[PDB]
Amino acid sequence: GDLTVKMLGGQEILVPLRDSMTVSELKQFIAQKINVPAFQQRLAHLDSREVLQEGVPLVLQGLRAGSTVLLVVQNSISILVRNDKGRSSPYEVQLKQTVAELKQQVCQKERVQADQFWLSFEGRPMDDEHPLEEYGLMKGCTVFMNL
Amino acid sequence: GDLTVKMLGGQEILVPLRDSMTVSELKQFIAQKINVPAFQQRLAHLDSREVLQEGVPLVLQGLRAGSTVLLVVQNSISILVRNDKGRSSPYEVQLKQTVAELKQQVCQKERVQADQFWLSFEGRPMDDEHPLEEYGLMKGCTVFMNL
Amino acid sequence: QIEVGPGATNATINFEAGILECYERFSWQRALDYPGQDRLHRLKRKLESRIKTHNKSEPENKRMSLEERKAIGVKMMKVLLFMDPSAGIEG
Amino acid sequence: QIEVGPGATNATINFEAGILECYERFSWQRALDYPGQDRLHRLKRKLESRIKTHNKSEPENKRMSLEERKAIGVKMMKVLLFMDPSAGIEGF
């Protein structure tokens, strides 16, 4: 078969999936064809509005030759936060998201509570309610954890 | 007591209402203060973001001396739609709200699904994607449920 | 610059139509300041001239007026604000 | 027009802050055309100057960067678009 992926600027990508193909695979195909990495891609059924499930073949989610999927691209950058022992660990973060949410990401990434540390950039403390753009993180920049 | 109605542009409107007045009485009050009719007003708590319940006095919904209420004005109107059994039922709608949500609205309002009936104005079938300004509805007029 | 394909002029028509409708809804709350109100009006005029010149070069089967472009404008605005395609439709 | 009072200037700063965030997100879809992309950047710069002139004549306890002004902007946009005050950060 063959499936159409539409985007808000009228692009339409024609991705052909046959067997048990997975939405991860879909995102990868479209990623190659549009130079936008699979994680920066949110996909949803055209009108069924249910955001598709990951590990499952698309052919279960009622996807078929002729169907249409909408792709919206969310932008984020990759950064590093480093821990008390000094090991940077990567993270994919959205600039509008809150710090709290990065803070909550570094919790379960490094198994700690979020009541314990500062979180600082350019040795500037980062307030849990503000968004990350406030502090101007860039690609591959490095945030600090302060117990 | 003293309650502040805050609108998007920073205006605040200090309705002194201790009482046990309902929300109709509040919308009426403010409607007198800023010349916007009760029907064109949506309201919610400032932090609870929940839109207030009509039947209940505002003293029950945890509004206190110095509370805060958000007021949004929507140039919309009021209308009747009447069902197969012949009983009319009031509905406030947005001119740009489309007949699709007016349909889904009378669904649970009445108690039926959406997939069965036309909906008509002046013996004109109404088309699901199209909005309501299309069909020139005025104050208080009447729409028909076509089984 | 960002590289855009064909149909970016059209989808920019629609996106800025919804931008206009946002303003309009805003100024109903007596919230649009005076330079911004005039920003609303310049936007509307410049948009309608863009809409007629654009619509002339499109099929009658896809030729839409300003007020119906503004409705797609809102539909693309809700997906942008909630970063969900699941907000385009009754969500 | 209308009946606009003081502090509509602050709310228009914020409103536009969200308009800009909207153009930004839009452009991520390689959907903002070239004149519109320059419209986005002109919006950003003239917004930043309006924000610094504004913040200086306000309390430092209510002096906000463009990037925090854009969070309020998106919030008032979601309440206008869904015509629900219940959409500021509770409606989805």
From Swiss-Prot, chains A, B:
Record-listed S-nitrosocysteine modification sites: 76, 141
Domain Ubiquitin-like per the UniProt entry, residue ranges: 1-76, 77-147
Superkingdom assignment: Eukaryota
Main subcellular location: cytoplasm
Expression induction: By type I interferons.
GO biological process: defense response to bacterium; defense response to virus; integrin-mediated signaling pathway; ISG15-protein conjugation; modification-dependent protein catabolic process; negative regulation of protein ubiquitination; negative regulation of type I interferon-mediated signaling pathway; negative regulation of viral genome replication
One Gene Ontology molecular-function label: integrin binding
Tissue-specific expression: Expressed in endometrium and uterine flushings of pregnant cow. Also secreted. Not detected in spleen, liver, corpus luteum or muscle.
The entry's keywords: Antiviral defense, Cytoplasm, Disulfide bond, Isopeptide bond, Repeat, S-nitrosylation, Secreted, Ubl conjugation pathway
Name of the protein described by the UniProt record: Ubiquitin-like protein ISG15
Originating species: Bos taurus (Bovine)
Swiss-Prot record, chain C:
Recorded consequence of changing residue 50 to A: Complete loss of dsRNA-binding and 20% loss of inhibition of IFN-beta promoter
Effect of residue 78 to A: No effect on dsRNA-binding and 45% loss of inhibition of IFN-beta promoter
Reported effect, residue 62 to A: No effect on dsRNA-binding and inhibition of IFN-beta promoter
Record gene name: NS
Protein name in UniProt: Non-structural protein 1
Effect of mutating residue 69 to A: Complete loss of dsRNA-binding and inhibition of IFN-beta promoter
Annotated spans, RNA-binding and homodimerization: 1-85
Subcellular location: Host cytoplasm; Host nucleus
Binding partners and assembly: Homodimer. Interacts with and inhibits human G1P2 conjugation by UBE1L.
Protein task: Binds and inhibits the conjugation of the ubiquitin-like G1P2/ISG15 protein to its target proteins. Since G1P2/ISG15 is an early antiviral protein, NS1 may inhibit the host antiviral response. Prevents EIF2AK2/PKR activation, either by binding double strand RNA or by interacting directly with EIF2AK2/PKR. Also binds poly(A) and U6 snRNA.
Outcome when changing residue 46 to A: Partial loss of dsRNA-binding and 15% loss of inhibition of IFN-beta promoter
Annotated region described as G1P2-binding, given as residue ranges: 1-91
Superkingdom as given in the UniProt entry: Viruses
Effect ascribed to mutating residue 42 to A: Complete loss of dsRNA-binding and 40% loss of inhibition of IFN-beta promoter
Record note on what altering residue 70 to A does: Complete loss of dsRNA-binding and inhibition of IFN-beta promoter
Documented effect of changing residue 30 to A: Partial loss of dsRNA-binding and no effect on inhibition of IFN-beta promoter
Motif (Nuclear localization signal): 42-47
Family, as annotated: Belongs to the influenza B viruses NS1 family.
Domain remark from Swiss-Prot or TrEMBL: Both N-terminus and C-terminus can inhibit IFN-beta promoter activation and IRF-3 nuclear translocation.
